[PDB]
Structure formats: C-alpha cells, structure tokens
Ligand binder design. Structure first.
Ligand SMILES: O=C(O)[C@]1(O)C=C(c2cccc(Sc3ccccc3)c2)[C@@H](O)[C@H](O)C1
Ligand SMILES: O=C(O)[C@]1(O)C=C(c2cccc(Sc3ccccc3)c2)[C@@H](O)[C@H](O)C1
Ligand SMILES: O=C(O)[C@]1(O)C=C(c2cccc(Sc3ccccc3)c2)[C@@H](O)[C@H](O)C1
Ligand SMILES: O=C(O)[C@]1(O)C=C(c2cccc(Sc3ccccc3)c2)[C@@H](O)[C@H](O)C1
Ligand SMILES: O=C(O)[C@]1(O)C=C(c2cccc(Sc3ccccc3)c2)[C@@H](O)[C@H](O)C1
Ligand SMILES: O=C(O)[C@]1(O)C=C(c2cccc(Sc3ccccc3)c2)[C@@H](O)[C@H](O)C1
Ligand SMILES: O=C(O)[C@]1(O)C=C(c2cccc(Sc3ccccc3)c2)[C@@H](O)[C@H](O)C1
Ligand SMILES: O=C(O)[C@]1(O)C=C(c2cccc(Sc3ccccc3)c2)[C@@H](O)[C@H](O)C1
Ligand SMILES: O=C(O)[C@]1(O)C=C(c2cccc(Sc3ccccc3)c2)[C@@H](O)[C@H](O)C1
Ligand SMILES: O=C(O)[C@]1(O)C=C(c2cccc(Sc3ccccc3)c2)[C@@H](O)[C@H](O)C1
Lengths: 149, 149, 149, 149, 149, 149, 149, 149, 149, 149, 149, 149
C-alpha cells in the first residue's frame, strides 16, 4: 500500500491512555489525543492519514498488526511495556513482509531501569526512535512516508 | 481516599479462580471465594469495604488498576504468574501516584523455581508479603487500613 | 477422560492463524486450516476427535486450559510465542493433574534466536516435539492417544 | 508447643539498635524499644508473650535461634544485613523442625540496592514480610499466632 | 538414498544398553531390545528398515554417523549423555548434508538437571522429540518416513 | 543558544568518510558529502545552520564536543564505533549541561552484532535514532531545532 | 610442630553443636561428642592428640586458627556455613604458612543447594573432604598425621 | 555386595598412566603402579580386594562402570579430565543404584584453573576427596570398606 | 566534631593483628603496632589524636562504628576480609551521617583474587585508598583532617 | 631516576581540562590549573618537581607514559574515562618495569555507574586512590616521594 | 628431539577424514590426503619428516600425544571439535614438557558459533593458527622447525 | 591488485615501538626494527614489498587502514591492545572488501589475562596467528602472498 491509498496504523500499548497525567518530567504533559492530533497533522503534511489506537492487551495489539499488514501502509508502534516482554508482538511484526515499521518510545529507555534497556520490537522495527518525546511519533510518521512512496 | 469512602481494590491474576482444587501442600485448601470472604471480614474490622476481583488477562488487570486509580483507597494484588512477567502491571501501579499497594503471595516464591524469585510488581508494591498463605491478603488489607486512614 | 469419551484440546498461540502465508521454509505451506485437518485425521485413526482452537491472547489460552482440565482428554499445544514469555500458560497447565499434555513446535526453536531456545511450557508439558513440521501435531495426537488409554 | 505456653522469640540483626535516629523516610520514626512495644501489644492481642532481642553478632543470633528451638514457640526475625550474607543464620533456622518462622523487612528490600534483593533467610522462613514498616512485625506475630496453634 | 532402498540408522549413546534395569519412573520398563523392536515395527509400517546400534563411545558414534551419510536414508539418534557434551557428534551430523536426522530423548530434558537442558545435536537435528518415552523413537522413524519418502 | 544565534554541530565518528562506498544494503548509497547536504537543507528548513564534521580520532571528537559546548546550540552525533567503546565521548557529552544532544545511527544497531546493541552515548543523548538511515540525521536536526526553540 | 609435640586442632563451625538431633539422612546420628571421640581415637591411632572445639562465631573461629598456628601441628576444619561466606577464615588460614589444613564436609556439598558448592576454605586448605560422613574427620586426622610426622 | 565377596573397582582416567614423571609439585612422584600398590594395601587391611584400571577412553570407563555395577562392591574413581567434561560417566554411575562411589582427585581442583573447579562425577559420588595426594585413594578405599559393610 | 575534640577512629579488620608476621612481599614488615604509631603521628601533625582498634569479629566492629558515631571526628577503616563480605559494616557506616569515612587497603586489591576486587565498604566510604602500603592509613588520617577541619 | 634527579610525570585524561567548570558536588570547584599548583606545591614539600599534563587522546597519553618511562621519577595518573576503557594505557604503564605508578580518581568511582567501577589501570598502578577529591593527587605525589626518594 | 632425528606428529581430530567432501566455502576444496601431502612437503623443506594421523576418538588422540611425547620433535594439531570439549587432550598436551605444540584450525573459529570461540588446547599450544586455510598447517610445520631447530 | 602491484600494509598498534626492551620471555628480544627487517625479507621471498608502520593511535591505524583499502595488496596487523577494545579498527577492516587481512599476536593471548582472550579484529581478519612469536608476521606475510598473488 501507499500513503495515498491507505492509512499509517499508529499503535499504542499499555498505560498510554493515561499519558499526560503524570511524570511529565519523563513523558511531558501532552495527552494521548494530543499525540494522535500530532499524527494526523504529521500524515496530512505528507498526503496520508493515520489510524490511531491504544490497548492494554497484547493479543489485540497483535490482532491490529494482523489488520495493518493487510490494510495499512505502515506502522508506527509504541509497544510501551510490551516493548520489553512481548515476543508475540515481535512475531506479529515479523509476518509484516516489507510493510515498514517504526518503534517509538517517548522516554529514552537506555537511561532508565535495566529491564527497560532491551526491546523485542527493535528486532523487526526498521527504525527506532527514543527520547524524542511525542515528536518521535512525528518522526515515525515522516519515516513511514519516506519509505512507503 | 479513606477506608470509609471507598473499597480496597483486591485483584487476582491467572489461575487463581482455581484456588482450592489442587496442590494443598503449597497453596492450601481455601478457595478464592473463601479468600474473598476473609478480605470482606478484615476490611470491615477497620471501617472498610473491598472490590475483590480475579482475571487471567494481563490487560484487564491493567484496565482495573486504571479503575482503582480513581475509585479506591488502595490495592491488594496477588499478580500470580504475572508477577514474574508483567512489566505492564508494574507500569500500571506506577501511574497510581500516592496510593498504597500491597503485593501478596500465598507461597514463599523465594523457596521455589528461580523465575518465581523475581516480581516486577515488588518494584512498586509498597509492601510485599509472601508465603503467609491466604492470611497474607489479610495483612494486605490490614496494611492498606494502616496507610489509608 | 479417555479418547473415545472426550476430545483432545488443540491449542495454538499467537500469529498461527496466519501460517502458510509466508516464510514457509521455516513453517511449511500448510494453513492453520490444513493443520486442523491433519489433526481431525490423526485423532480419528485412534478413535478420537479434537477441539481445535487458536488465540492471540494469553488469558484466552489460560481460559481454554481451564476448560480442557474439565472437559477433555488431553492437550496438544503450540504456544507459539508464549512458550517463551508465559509463566501464566505454564501455571495453567500445572493445574492439570494427570492430564496428558504435549508441547508442539513446527520449527526447531533450538536453532533459532537465542531467546526462543527456552520454553516455559516445557517445564510441565509431558512431551515436546520440535522441528518435526506440522507433522509434530500428528505426533502430538499420537502421544495423547497412547496416554489417554 | 502452643502460643499459650512459650514466648515467641523476636530477633533483630545488626544496626537495628539505632532504628529511629535516621532515614525515617526508609525505616520510620519508631525506635526498637517502640517496635518491641508493638510486639508485646501484638502478641497479647493473641494470647501470647514475646522474648525480644537485638544483636550485631552473627553468631549470637545463631545462638539465640538454637535457644528458641527448645524454648520458644515461634520466631519473628529481621536479620537486617545478615539477611544478604548469613548462611549461618539460614542453617540455624534450618535445624528448626516444625517451628514457624516469619522473616521481617521494614523496608522493601526489592526496591533498594541489588545486593539487598536476596535474603538467605528467605530460603527457610515460612512467611517473608517486607516494606510493611514496623507494622511488618505485627504481621510476623499474627502469623506465628496463627500457626503456633 | 531413499526409504525404499536403505535402512534407517538408529544410534543410541552411552548407557542406553541398560535402559530398563532401573529408574522406570523416568525411562519406562522397556529394554534396548524392546525399543529396537518397536523401531522394527514403525519402520515397516511406513515401508522401511532399520540399522539399530548402541555405543558408549563418542568416537564410534561419529564413526557410525559417517557411515549413515553414505549407507543409510537417515538418522534417529538418542545421544544420551553426549547430547549435552558432544560437539564432535554435532559436527558429524553437520557432514550429513541433506540427510534427515531426528534427535530423541526418552525423558523430558527440560524438566531435569539444568545441564541437561542444552543439546549440541539439537543444533543440527531437523526434528527433536523429547519426553515422549520410547514412543519418541516411533515418531522419529515416522518423520524419517515422511522426509525420506 | 538557538539555531538563530548558533550552528548545530553535527559530529561524525570513524569510517563515516567512506559512507556510501560498499554494503549499500546496510548504510546505503548516499555519501558523507550527500549526508551533510541533507543536514544543510534540514537545518535551513528550521531557521538554522550546521557545523558538520567527521573524525576517526576519539580524542578529537571529544575536543569537538567541547567547542560546541561553548559555541553551538546543539549536537547531533553519529559516534559510529565509538558509540560502543567510548567512555571519553559520553563524559564529553556530560560536560554539555543544558545542551540538547541527539544520537543517530544509520542502521538499526539492535538488529546487528550483539556488541553493537549497547551505546555509551545513549546514557546522555536526550534522544537516539537508529535504522532510519540518513533520514535519521534529519530527525536529529528536527529534534535539535525543536528543543532549541 | 609434630603430633608428638603438639595437638591437631579440630575446628567446627556453626550449628554443628546440634549435630545428632536431626536430619540424619544427610548428617547422620553421631553427635558432636561422638565426633570428638571419633577424632581422639584416630589421632591416638596414628600417634597424636586433638584440641577439638566448636563455635557459631566467625571471629572466634579466626582467633582459634591463630592459636593453632603457634601451638598446634595441623588444622582439620568443618567451617559449616562459614565455608561459603567467610573470607576471614580463608585469610586466617593463609596466615598459617606450611601449617597443614584439611577441610571437612560431613555432606557432599556438590549435591546440595548451589550456594553450597563453593568454599572459600577450599582455596587454601591443603586437602578438602566432602560427603564422607563423620568419617571424613578421621581422614583429615589421618592426613595431618601423614603430613606432620 | 560386601567387601568379603567382590573386589573394589579402582578407575583412573586419562593421562594418569604417566603419573609420577612431572609436576611432582602437583601430583607427586608415586606412579600408577605405586598408587595401585597403596590400594592393594588399603583394601587388604579392611578385608578386601581391588580391581585397578586406567583408560584414556571415556566410553571404556563407562563399560567398566557398567561392569562394577554387577561384579564389584564399589567404585573409587579418579576421572581425571573427564570429571569436568563427562556427563556420560556421571550417568554410568547414576545407574548403579545403592553402590558406594567415592571420587578422588590427587590435586586440590579448587586451587587450580576455574575449568577444574567443577566435576560432573561429584553429583553422584557419595564422597569426594580432593587435595589429599595419592593418600586420597586410601581414604576412598576406607570409605568404601566402611560402606560395603 | 573536629580533630580538636574527638579522636579519629581507626578500625582494623580481621587478621591484621598478625600484620608484619608474613608475606611482607604483599603487606610489608611493619607490624600493626608500627601502623598505629604511624597513625598517632599523622594525627599529631594535624592537631589530632587517634583511637586505634583491631578486631576479628564482624560484630564488635559494628559496635565500634556505633561508638565512633557519637564520639569521634571521622573513621579510617581497613575492613580487611570484611570489605568483601560484610553488608553490616557497610550499614553500620551508613549510620554515621556526614561523618568522614576513608577506607584503606594495604595491598592493591584490584590485582588479587577476583573475590578481593569488590568492597561493600567502598559504597559508603567517602574515599578509598589501596596499594599504598601502610602509608595509606596516613593518607586516611590526612583526608579526615582535611574534612573534620 | 629519582625525585632529586627527575620530575614526577603527572598525567590527566579526557575532559579534565574542564575541571571546576561544572558539577562541583561531584568533582569540586578547583580547576586543573588549581590542581597543578597543588602538585607543584605537594612535590616541593617533599624534595621534588612535577611535569603536569592533560590530554583527551588515548595515544598521546601513551606517548607521554613512554616518555616518563625514560625521563621522570614516577607517574601519578588520573586516566579519567580511559581508566575504564584503555588496555593500551595499562599496557603502556606495564612497560615501566620498576617505576612507581599511582592511580587517582577524584570521585569515588565505586559509588557511581557500574561501568566506572573497574579500571584497567588498577591492574598495574601500584597505588590507587579514589574519593579523596583533588587531595588524592597530593597523596599520589606523597606516594611517589616515599617510593622514589 | 630435532627435525633431523624425529618426525613432527600431526594429529587430526574428529570428522576431518571428510575434509574435501563438503562446505569448501568454509573448509576448502582439498582433502586430508591433500593436507597430509602439504605437511610432508613443508617438513621436507626444513629437512624434517611428519607422521600424519586422523582420529574421531578422543582417548586415541590422547594415546598418540603420549606417543608423540617420546618419539617426535613437535606436535601440530587440528583437534577440530575436541578443541572445544577436551580438557583431556589439553592435559595430554600438558604432559609434554619442552615439546613444541602448534594448534591449527582451518576455519576462523572466532567467526563461528560462539561455542567455537574457545579451545582448551590453546591454553597449552605454544602457537595457534586459525582460518588461514590448509595453509595454517604449513605455518605449524614451519614453527615446529623454528623451535625444534 | 596483486603482490606484484602493491606493498603489503603492515600495521603495528600501541606500545610495539618498544619491542625488545622488556618481556623477552613473552615477546622476544627482537626490536620493532628487527621485526620490520623480517617482514621485508618475508615479502621479497614471495616477490613482494612491505609498507611497515607503527602507531599508538587508534584513529591513525584507522586512517592507515583506509589508505590500504586504496593502495596496498593486504594487511598484516598486530593490533596490540586495540585488539581488545577497538570496534573502530574492526569497522576499519570491515570496510576492506576482498582485501586479505591477517591478525598477529606475538604472545598467545589465550594463555594470558582473560580480557586478552577476546579481540574484535578477529571477527574480520581472515586469519589470526598467535603465540608464534614474530615468526607470526612471516606467516602473516606468507598468507597474504598466497591470497594476494
Ligand atoms: O518511554 C516510553 O515511550 C515507554 O515505551 C513507555 C512506557 C510507559 C511506562 C509507564 C507509563 C506509561 S503511560 C503514561 C505516561 C505518562 C503518564 C501517565 C501514563 C508508559 C514503558 O512501558 C516503556 O518502558 C517506555
Ligand atoms: O528493611 C529492613 O528491615 C532491612 O532488613 C534492614 C536493614 C538495615 C540497614 C541499615 C541500618 C538498619 S537499622 C536502622 C535503620 C534506620 C535508622 C537507624 C538504624 C537496618 C538492611 O540490612 C536490610 O538490607 C533491610
Ligand atoms: O532421555 C534421554 O533419552 C536422554 O538422552 C537419556 C539420558 C540418560 C541418563 C542416564 C542414563 C541413561 S541410560 C539408562 C536408562 C534407564 C536405566 C538405566 C540406564 C540415559 C541422558 O543421558 C540424557 O540427558 C537424556
Ligand atoms: O549504523 C550506524 O550509524 C553505525 O554507527 C555505523 C557504523 C559503521 C560501520 C562500518 C562503517 C561505517 S562508516 C561507513 C559506512 C558505509 C561505507 C563505508 C563506511 C560505520 C558502526 O560503527 C555502528 O555500529 C553503526
Ligand atoms: O556437611 C557439612 O559438614 C557442612 O559443613 C555443614 C553444614 C550444615 C548446615 C546446617 C546444619 C549443620 S550442623 C547440624 C546438622 C544436623 C543437625 C543439627 C545441626 C551443618 C553446611 O553449612 C555446609 O554446607 C556443609
Ligand atoms: O588431581 C587429580 O587427580 C586430577 O583428577 C588429575 C588431572 C591430571 C592432569 C594432567 C595430568 C594428569 S596425570 C599426570 C600427573 C603427573 C605427570 C604426568 C601426568 C592428571 C586433572 O585432569 C584433574 O582435574 C585433576
Ligand atoms: O590489603 C589489605 O589491606 C586488605 O584490606 C587486607 C587483607 C588481608 C589478608 C590476609 C591477611 C591480612 S593481615 C595479616 C598480614 C600478614 C600476616 C598476618 C596477617 C590482611 C585482605 O583480606 C583484603 O583483601 C585487603
Ligand atoms: O573520578 C574521576 O576522577 C574520574 O577519573 C573522572 C571522570 C570524569 C568524568 C567527567 C568529567 C571529568 S572532568 C570535568 C570535571 C568538572 C567539570 C568538567 C569536566 C572527569 C571519569 O571519566 C572517571 O570515571 C572518574
Ligand atoms: O576450522 C577448523 O579447523 C575446526 O577445527 C574444524 C571443525 C570441523 C567440524 C566439522 C567437520 C570438519 S571437517 C569436514 C570438512 C568438510 C567436509 C566434511 C568434513 C571440521 C570444527 O570441529 C572446529 O570447531 C573448527
Ligand atoms: O602479543 C601481542 O602481540 C599483543 O598483540 C601485544 C600486546 C602488548 C602489550 C603491552 C606491550 C606491548 S609491546 C611491548 C612488548 C614487550 C616489550 C615492550 C613493548 C604489546 C598486548 O596488548 C596484546 O594483548 C597482545
């Protein structure tokens, strides 16, 4: 698919619903609809749209990767916690043959807890953006656009 | 919140619906409904009520820690197997700024298989109780009373 | 339960719905539907039937394992990526006192990524077939047949 | 050897003589005398007495463990720093057939330094209580009260 | 070579000569003769023959593997102790290009002593079957049937 | 300092001078001159200039991080190999208090040799981009331009 | 020193005062008094005399090795739990140049918990005996005789 | 089998043929002939005999262990290098339900190279003597005599 | 407290009482008495006094750190073996708030046995000095002077 | 070469040029220039002179080590970052048979990130001082005097 | 023994009988007869002869080292798989005091699976050549000649 | 390019400038200039010339390697200490497609400090020569001549 012909799937994993409500010194005060708004503007700036979701359930994120592989031109995914534990999500993205994928972490995970240092997604994520705050979704977006067409 | 306003959320993770039915030597012969009754008792004796729940679904448990965040005076969680795996629930509890959390295990995990040794949830549980059998959630309830009112 | 009296539960974990559609030199070219078919066949030859399911959700799998515990003669399981991350699954099958359980892998995970080398389910599962193709489902059904009898 | 006819032995390792002069944001405001008072109030709460002790010597705590074996009905122990070092104390508690043993940590040791996550005594203690404040000690006694008859 | 014109080589490694004088709780009551016999049946069932041997000698196993690389249609092997130690058999198997090879463990090694969890032979063995009791050989003969037929 | 008053220093480590001369599968066909010229255009588009440099010398990258410290509004750095070996550069970057720093990798380093998975610079770099190709440099300037504004 | 002139020192670490009263399937039914008597006899047997003592205190143990170093002809030592924790007794022992030392473990430690398989004592001790029953103390006596006379 | 009824099997592993010709600092200057002689002595003194062998071949030691299992009253073994590498030989010994095994090492393996620190044989041997020189064999024979009666 | 009014506590770990008496090629020929003389001179030069102690006993040192806590201007400790072993002495010293602590090793521990590389006391001591012989103490005194005045 | 005949090489590693320009809690507020002044002073107090240097470049420090090998009486070195990275600087100091080397870090590196805990240089430095601030330079000079002069 | 009066023993480990037959992108197109041929040619050139052997058996190889021990001027070995598993060949090679030992691998093992990275033999081999093709065998002869001549 | 068209680049890393001056038993009595003279001879002997260099500097060896990529027929390189620390250099050689690289260590690093055991360069070097003295340079040149001409 192209951006002209289909949306970017944007995917958000657990706890991100409450984004903007706390520890803004690590995550900022933008809320999750604030992020979504960025991504609409971001894709619009390039022709495309986005389809922005959030779930706290690993199987659903997996089900939405299944959909995107089929119906969308690329994925910007913040796996959030499942970044560090989900092989099922990684595997979901391994079936996405030549659908581009960007991982995105609002905080720089390399400077926080050692569990945080490692991510399964980065194994498939074509690129990975970290510590760019919610602007990094915007990079995820520009990247998807550059690649998809 | 106080004990007098809002109920202590009590959350139970995978397999625990089945508590009562096998391995007496490790887990006891009380069932989950009995556990729930022992908590009703304990909270009461301190002016409190409880919203006692179980689920096998990591994300639902996230959802519910989301709920208690707004609506309860504290959380008693037996994460069950999700203690050793779930960066998700760990993260959920961390959105619970201010609120007391007591993790409970029925078995002495420290005496068991290596992977049972670490709980992500103890990164955030205010208190941890292990191998005190089901009397352990009583301690939870007691300690939520202590910190709450 | 024995063979003639109840079904063998056959469980598939995440992404396997999708099997056949790529990387076949790792997975084969059989759909999940051909796998179910092979299974109906194998149970049949030994006078049994199968209760054959897939799910991308871990809790849904534990749920199904509770069911099997009650209603079925054994389990053949490909946990797909929870093999690796799911103490929840392990624990659920642990609750299955004298239920014959076989763990099945289409690929030989011991030749793959270091992180796939290890399975939680192998700690309970009675037998484990790896790298024997979709046919290991068939050995999976054969072994239950020998045990459930 | 019920709770009715023998004291609970209550042991405190190195440094705890000075409890309350520092880090009350970690260890509280209560002195050990105070703690000891809780212990008395908590044992009589359940129709028992306590024999409460503190020592900076590893071998004297070993000696007091052997004393409780013949003389006492249970042990409540916060082994302090020896928790992370003392196989002596572990081994002495091991000679303690039948006798109940709750291990106590006022602080959540799993939230502090990596060398504080592991406790030798945990490999024997029946209950391990942590992060529960000096109230962690009432729990210990409540747990002996329950097991000791 | 093919199933129709060459025996299946079946190699057994150290101590299997005594299989079934002791620890039936792990190995069953069937002798090595009984197992060869089962392999005689399962090979016929599929249009085949077997060349079943056993040696306590790591070098003779290599010797024999080299042989099968020309004389036999494939290899089922239970390396017994040399599984966890023999890079030399590993490497003998690696010279058997396009030859089918199933590794067989009667016990489930993943449920045993930790140094039994890793196999060298697994790195090359196309299929690995663990903890299926001697029936593991039949399965091993069946996959050779399938792949060599 | 802003892009307004000040050039964004963009620092490149060893072997970068050869960029676009072999292995285009990994690093591409764009060159070091080319890449700079993206940088120019990307700093232009956000009201700014670049100070774009390469070096094989760890000590001179250090010397250069000190320059910028006093004279530039930000650092975008692809440390190349020094990202994995260089405590000097990180300590350089840490002398850069209240200066924005963005680390770039052409490749996804998390998809490569295990020794490439860790970066020292990532303990200071506010943000980190990886496996977005030289676009990633553009992201780096976009982030610098943002933070300095 | 010789057996003629000077006793062999027999040192017993913590808990070994209780030897006899429990866990006989590991440590047996002989008592510390029984062992002393066993050792007097093995010394009498080979020309010598013993100075046989037992302590729960690491520093006393240490003190006594200093004494052995001036006044005695050998050290045979069961350090008990100290074998695994005590750098102090290791170095107490290293102060004893060309004094004979045999380390004694009633139990065979390479068969117990993993913390038990390492002894600091073994680093210096001339000989180490393990798993030979209280009889291994008679081997130390024997060994010291061989060495001192 | 008692001592009055069968020889004690003495097994010597690789390299020991040349015992005596070098590192008299670590091994002494008594040759194998000489060790063998010390054992004829030891056994006689205790009412018995020795069947004394040496092999550089791992499988040959297993053969002989299979043998002693049935024709002998017990094993004293110096596996030499194969203490560290041979799981096979470990399992040869496992098979000997109720036979007394004692492992001997002439040097103290806990003072040499880390790769010598660990022995697979120790996991079965009832006793281990290390660091007692050629006299350890003699302890091995006394231990068996003790046990074979 | 300052040099003027309170002695510098100088604590010496186990074994040091025998300082001088051997391996002067690692620790020198000065005796502990010589070192105390050094300390009395270094403090004198500074308008100070010292309180020079030595114990083999982990716990005694705990009591003396508690005594220095209220009665001295700083501490110069050589914990000797206890550096590497003793969390209590660490915890003890952490109780001395805003008291200058200097840790002193005579040998350079970073060149010895890998167990002697790590000191717990180094987590607290404001400063650590190794491999400067007995002169290290004198540096230890000078540092306290600098910091008690 | 002696204090009388030759200066002390005092060597400073990366980033130490900027000493006193930031985080004085951690490194103090003297400049490198101030430090120099102290060392001229400290060596004068003791009949000596100094050659005080700083460089960012691993290899030039190596050049300067080689130079001091032939020209100076000893080396006081603070290798900054290359303490932790630089085998070459260690190998260099290694070339200085018989020359006094003292390693100095201002901050107590053992109290920081794990990566600052190990120093290659500690492997050859005769003395190592850390956590004494800039005074520790003074001790290094004092140490060289005693060793040289 | 020099090259004039004695042949160099060239010892070849498991599987190398099959060199030529497969994987020439990894091991080369030449056979062992071909290698032997080189070795003859290279010894000839330095006035020496070679005694060239291959075994798949570990104790055989050990036998031939003991033989080379008294009858040859040096050893060249490609222990192939036993480089990574055989402490017994290492120890065999240790018995050869004064004998020049060169170890050779045709493949560059430090590029291979991570278990291929470590060779017991390299702990005793005076030189090790790896990944210089069958040519590495000639350097071996060359080196032995340097050292026996 | 061939041995006929261009010199062999011979790179010498840190500290090698001082060869001969110390550690003859480790490195020999040859000087750097002596080494070079062997290398010249070594190449003429094969109808080749050398370009022989040394530097203490990481980045300049990098620079030299880049020059060789253009101008030389191959690299012999003894990275010295940068062997264990330099991904810069590895990556410098990674740039050198189709250029024969031989790595040389005078000593056998696999016999030395555990950190010497690993070299990054070996990951790319076609061959590694070790412990062959400065004869390994001659072997390195040989190899290059084989590969290059
Ligand atoms: O930084 C991230 O984007 C990250 O991926 C996101 C995470 C995270 C952690 C806790 C909470 C939340 S959501 C949130 C953020 C701010 C306020 C409230 C909720 C996200 C973690 O799971 C990851 O480890 C890091
Ligand atoms: O939390 C505990 O109860 C703990 O067991 C007790 C400890 C401890 C550590 C230092 C001092 C003290 S005692 C104290 C506490 C607060 C103020 C004064 C003294 C206890 C640590 O040894 C353990 O790691 C944790
Ligand atoms: O399960 C297996 O087949 C296995 O390969 C078999 C093994 C084994 C272990 C001990 C003895 C024997 S043979 C035997 C079996 C039963 C009774 C007596 C001997 C095999 C182990 O060596 C392996 O770890 C696992
Ligand atoms: O991906 C990167 O940006 C990276 O920093 C760049 C690296 C790298 C590796 C080889 C060569 C070069 S520079 C180059 C690129 C293409 C052709 C020639 C040289 C960089 C590695 O040092 C790092 O792992 C990864
Ligand atoms: O086996 C030994 O002699 C050993 O020294 C003894 C130990 C030990 C452990 C617990 C208790 C005792 S003593 C004892 C034995 C039986 C009953 C009562 C006390 C010894 C362990 O600490 C060591 O791991 C090994
Ligand atoms: O100490 C032992 O008895 C030991 O079993 C014996 C060994 C050993 C090593 C090399 C040679 C020999 S035999 C020998 C002794 C002296 C000179 C020549 C050969 C034994 C090692 O393999 C073991 O780790 C330790
Ligand atoms: O180097 C030290 O000063 C140290 O603190 C002191 C130690 C030590 C070790 C053995 C003996 C002694 S004291 C001694 C010295 C010579 C003869 C007798 C006793 C100290 C080690 O425990 C520590 O690793 C390091
Ligand atoms: O503690 C030290 O002296 C150390 O040697 C010095 C270091 C260090 C770290 C950052 C900056 C500086 S220099 C500096 C000091 C103040 C302001 C600016 C730069 C030194 C680290 O490289 C080392 O890990 C530790
Ligand atoms: O590279 C080597 O020389 C090596 O020593 C040789 C080995 C090896 C492994 C399997 C087969 C062969 S020989 C061979 C070559 C081509 C076809 C068939 C067999 C060598 C491995 O055992 C070692 O890890 C590496
Ligand atoms: O052995 C080598 O060839 C080596 O390449 C060279 C090294 C080395 C180390 C210190 C000094 C020198 S050069 C030297 C050698 C002897 C006397 C003087 C200088 C080389 C080591 O760094 C490496 O670990 C190995």
């Amino acid at each position: 698919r192209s951006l002209a012909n289909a949306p970017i799937m944007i995917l958000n994993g657990p706890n991100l619903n409450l984004l903007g409500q706390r520890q803004p010194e690590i995550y900022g005060s933008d809320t999750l609809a604030d992020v979504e708004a960025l991504c609409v503007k971001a894709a619009a700036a390039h022709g495309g749209t986005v389809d922005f979701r959030q779930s706290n359930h690993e199987g659903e994120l997996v089900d939405w990767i299944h959909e995107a592989r089929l119906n969308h031109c690329g994925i910007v995914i913040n796996p959030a916690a499942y970044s560090h534990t989900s092989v099922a999500i990684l595997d979901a993205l391994n079936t996405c043959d030549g659908l581009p994928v960007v991982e995105v972490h609002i905080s720089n995970i390399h400077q926080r807890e050692p569990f945080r240092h490692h991510s399964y997604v980065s194994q498939r994520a074509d690129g990975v953006v970290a510590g760019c705050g919610v602007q990094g979704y915007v990079f995820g977006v520009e990247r998807i656009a550059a690649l998809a067409g």
